[PDB]
Amino acid sequence: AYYDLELRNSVMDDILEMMPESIRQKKARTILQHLSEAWRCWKANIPWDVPGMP
RNA sequence: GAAUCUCUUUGCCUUUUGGCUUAGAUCAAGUGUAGUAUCUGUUCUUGUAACAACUGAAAUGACCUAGGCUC
């Protein structure tokens, strides 16, 4: 669980580093959700392709 | 030209979500397993007369400085 949390944090940090945002807290949650979805897809062996994802 | 108000579109907006794990597990089972705790009614519970004695209690309020008499 701890490891997962750490990973999530790292990902969030990376995303923050990446580009400018206004009211980023809200977006953080979304990012986390996306990450989770991706992980799930990987587990399943579904390709995680989302069109809006830059 | 300037002040303001009303409506529509674009931008900005929760055109929708704050974790992880074996999709967390299962849509099944004479269950097994461990523990923790005590109950039924039926009964006990002298009169009459005379003499000696008192005629009356309690409540709160009216006087005086808890106490003392009167109503």
Swiss-Prot record:
Region of the whole protein represented: 752 to 805 of 2413
Coiled-coil segments: none
Origin: domain of life: Eukaryota
Function: Functions as a scaffold that mediates the ordered assembly of spliceosomal proteins and snRNAs. Required for association of BRR2 with the spliceosomal U5 snRNP, and the subsequent assembly of the U4/U6-U5 tri-snRNP complex. Functions as a scaffold that positions spliceosomal U2, U5 and U6 snRNAs at splice sites on pre-mRNA substrates, so that splicing can occur. Interacts with both the 5' and the 3' splice site, as well as the branch region. Has a role in branch site-3' splice site selection. Associates with the branch site-3' splice 3'-exon region. Also has a role in cell cycle.
Signal peptide: none
Additional observations: Present with 468 molecules/cell in log phase SD medium.
Species name: Saccharomyces cerevisiae (strain ATCC 204508 / S288c)
Subcellular location: Nucleus
Subunit details: Component of the U4/U6-U5 tri-snRNP complex composed of the U4, U6 and U5 snRNAs and at least PRP3, PRP4, PRP6, PRP8, PRP18, PRP31, PRP38, SNU13, SNU23, SNU66, SNU114, SPP381, SMB1, SMD1, SMD2, SMD3, SMX2, SMX3, LSM2, LSM3, LSM4, LSM5, LSM6, LSM7, LSM8, BRR2 and DIB1.
Protein name as it appears in the record: Pre-mRNA-splicing factor 8
Domain note: The MPN (JAB/Mov34) domain has structural similarity with deubiquitinating enzymes, but lacks the residues that would bind the catalytic metal ion. Contains a region with structural similarity to reverse transcriptase, presenting the classical thumb, fingers and palm architecture, but lacks enzyme activity, since the essential metal-binding residues are not conserved.
